[PDB]
Amino acid sequence: VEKNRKIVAENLEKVQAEAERLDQEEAQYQREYSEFKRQQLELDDELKSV
């Protein structure tokens, strides 16, 4: 029972950490998407201005 409980607590901490890491990765990916979409919008706006 204690082995199971220790494994469970460790895995719960690991799952919380994995969720936080996924959140950070998603924030970075949203930043990259922001950069790419801003590039697309600026390029379209420049083509239109030209």
């Binding site: 199971n4 409980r5 469970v8 895995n11 719960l12 799952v15 969720a19």
Partner: protein, 49 residues
């Protein structure tokens, strides 16, 4: 008095074995409850994630 001491020793041994079984069971129950609560929270967080 001597026989009383010897019998007290042996009977307290048997009783302590039972009591130890009991305390171990209580601890196992507490651990199982904690594990269930953690599993529930983990499931909810996993769904949200």
């Amino acid at each position: 008095m001597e026989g009383k001491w010897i019998t007290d020793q042996l009977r307290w041994k048997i009783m302590s074995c039972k009591m130890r079984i009991e305390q171990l069971k209580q601890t196992i129950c507490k651990g199982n409850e904690e594990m269930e609560k953690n599993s529930e929270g983990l499931l909810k967080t996993k769904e949200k994630n």
